Structure 1
Amino acid sequence: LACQEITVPLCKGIGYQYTYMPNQFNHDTQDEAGLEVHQFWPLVEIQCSPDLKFFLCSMYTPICLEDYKKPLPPCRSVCERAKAGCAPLMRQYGFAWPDRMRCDRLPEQGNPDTLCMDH
């Protein structure tokens, strides 16, 4: 995991500046991952959930630390907060919560195998 500075415009200033490739969706470049997070931009600007921008970026552009060389995904709570805030508005326009963004795939905090980030 060699850290690369984040160039995805939607994911700048989220809390961390470095990421790695490939991500959980097997995107080889940030430009490939950028094309999918920018498809979520209307939900992000409306601010249906304050955790939406961080949750999306924590998966498409996962944080990279040269000191801590282990992948750390977002905690389940981050996903469920973003879902509870935006999925009703999503359902109002006929769009369901993507299966790739299912919260059950993420680990809960307190997990012995992997560490996750939540404020």
Structure 2
Amino acid sequence: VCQEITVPMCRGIGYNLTHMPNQFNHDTQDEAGLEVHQFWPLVEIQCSPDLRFFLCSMYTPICLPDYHKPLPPCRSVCERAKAGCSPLMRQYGFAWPERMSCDRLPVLGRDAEVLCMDY
């Protein structure tokens, strides 16, 4: 079922409803929120206008009542967030996370059936 997003950083990014489990097999929004919370300093410095949406699109993925196929962000969204923010993370000892590697995401419009979120 669809549930109103309760992860504070992921409200006001363009959609209201999510569903668990997410990509990472978090079972609740609480669990997902406790993890995405750690990215707040990266969102604050604005190394990429895409980062917050990209993160939320994975941690609290959009839920549409009638749609049951996954709606990941598009690869291009990941790539822009990574290009923007990776150097800064790298500068603080953090690598771009394994679970966020962009090549796991669909390319926009490559397959008619495979939809994805652009920003």
Bin the TM-score by the shorter chain: over 0.9
Question: Could you tell me which residue of structure 2 aligns to residue 83 of structure 1?
Answer: 82
- Give the partner amino acid of 2:98: D
Superposed CA deviations along residues 79-114 of structure 1, whole A, max 9, x for unmatched, are 000000000111111100000000001010113241
1:34: how far off?
A: 0.2
1:45: how far off?
A: 0.8
Return structure 1 stretches of 4+ with deviation > 3 angstroms: none
TM-score normalised by length of structure 1 = 0.95
Task: Extract unaligned runs of 5+ from structure 1.
Answer: none
Q: Hey, what's the Cα distance between the residues in 2 that align with 1:68 and 1:35?
A: 27
SS of the residue 1:67 aligns to: coil
Question: Could you tell me which residue of structure 1 aligns to residue 44 of structure 2?
Answer: 45
- 1:1-119 superposed matches below 5 A: 2-112=1-111, 113-119=113-119
Task: Extract unaligned runs of 5+ from structure 2.
Answer: none
SS of the residue 1:91 aligns to: helix
SS of the residue 1:33 aligns to: helix
Count of paired positions: 118
- Give the partner amino acid of 1:16: Y
Q: Hey, what's the Cα distance between the residues in 1 that align with 2:94 and 2:110?
A: 31
Q: Hey, what's the Cα distance between the residues in 1 that align with 2:44 and 2:2?
A: 28
